[PDB]
Amino acid sequence: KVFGRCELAAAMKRHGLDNYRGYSLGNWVCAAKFESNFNTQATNRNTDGSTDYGILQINSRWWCNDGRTPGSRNLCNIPCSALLSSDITASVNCAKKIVSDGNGMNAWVAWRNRCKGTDVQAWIRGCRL
């Protein structure tokens, strides 16, 4: 599923991400836009052989099991395929664990390079929330 911008903002808010560890909703929407273009089915292979999955491009190196990332962990205790569902629940719950781990949203390099310090509230402008 490819979410609309305000559609995804609504789904993220419903799931508790708005100001989760201090990150306003627009941070999350911005990260999703640049990670996946709002497409729940997005996958991207990393140089080290891990893969990033879903709307927030969660990596198999640490967070999910895909059965093909040697030496990795599965800290969210999920198959990476669950991160590709039209229902964002698994992505959101695993994102909460990630963002809580010490580095905040800097875990998402695209957030740090394209959203951090920007007018992220623009990502939710006009949305009914």
Ligand X SMILES: O=C(O)/C=C/c1ccc(C(=O)O)cc1
Residue 3 within binding range of ligand X, rule CB under 6 A: no
Question: Does the annotation list 119 as a binding residue?
Answer: no
* # of chain residues touching ligand X (CB under 6 A): 6
Do residues 53 and 64 lie in contact, with contact meaning Cβ atoms separated by under 8 Å? Answer: yes
Q: What are phi and psi of 30, to 5 degrees?
A: -55, -45
Residue 24 within binding range of Cl ion, rule CB under 5 A: yes
Residue 69 within binding range of Cl ion, rule CB under 5 A: yes
Closer Cβ to Cl ion, 16 or 67, answer by number? 67
Could you give the 3-state DSSP secondary structure of residue 129? coil
Could you give the 3-state DSSP secondary structure of residue 88? coil
- The sign one gets for the Cα dihedral 6, 9, 11, 13 is negative
Q: Footprint of Cl ion on residues 39-68 (CB under 5 A)?
A: 67
Candidate ranges 8-16, 44-52, 57-65, 76-84; the one touching ligand X (CB under 6 A): 44-52
